[PDB]
């Protein structure tokens, strides 16, 4: 990991920015993955899958 | 180098957790849903004599 060390860990300002980006992108990726699992486990149960949606007299 | 790489992984979570808790408190002070549901209506009015002001 010394190649990555020489680029990110050398300065604490860069290391702090790396942590900020990792929290930003990492949380977005986990959020996307959780939503994919949520959709796959609940097929046909969402509000968008109501057959008579928009057809109330 | 490997240790710093591994420790940064958990630092990702700590920053996210702190950001979530702080933001959740801040947004709780924003306008509630019952408040936002009363922001659009219409009212009709009539006529008044000249030189006057009705509120």
């Amino acid at each position: 990991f010394e190649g990555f060390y020489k680029l990110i860990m050398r300065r604490n300002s860069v290391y702090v920015t790396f942590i900020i980006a990792g929290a930003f992108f990492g949380e977005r990726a986990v959020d996307y993955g959780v939503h994919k699992l949520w959709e796959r486990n609940n097929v046909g149960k969402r509000y968008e899958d109501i057959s008579v949606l928009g057809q109330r007299p | 180098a490997f240790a710093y790489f591994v420790l940064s992984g958990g630092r990702f979570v700590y920053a996210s957790v702190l950001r979530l808790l702080v933001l959740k408190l801040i947004v709780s002070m924003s306008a509630s849903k019952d408040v936002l549901a009363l922001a659009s209506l219409e009212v009709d009015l009539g006529s008044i004599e000249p030189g006057t002001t009705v509120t």
Partner: peptide, 28 residues
Amino acid sequence: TIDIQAAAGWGIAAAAGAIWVVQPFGWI
């Protein structure tokens, strides 16, 4: 001449954190 680089490096971190706490993607 490294204090200036320290300021620029920390300015990027401050900018990166600001876009991270407040995420104004729907405003830009």
